[PDB]
């Protein structure tokens, strides 16, 4: 996803906000 997070609010649905940044399936899409 590579999105980024404020606390852990990410927009894709799926995407896991880890670091400030949403991952998905274990790495940053």
Same mark, same amino acid.
């Given at each position: 996803c590579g999105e980024t997070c404020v606390g852990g609010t990410c927009? =894709? #649905?799926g995407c896991t906000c880890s670091w400030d940044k949403? =991952?998905?399936n274990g790495? #940053?899409?």
């Open positions: 927009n =894709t #649905p949403c =991952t998905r790495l #940053p899409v």
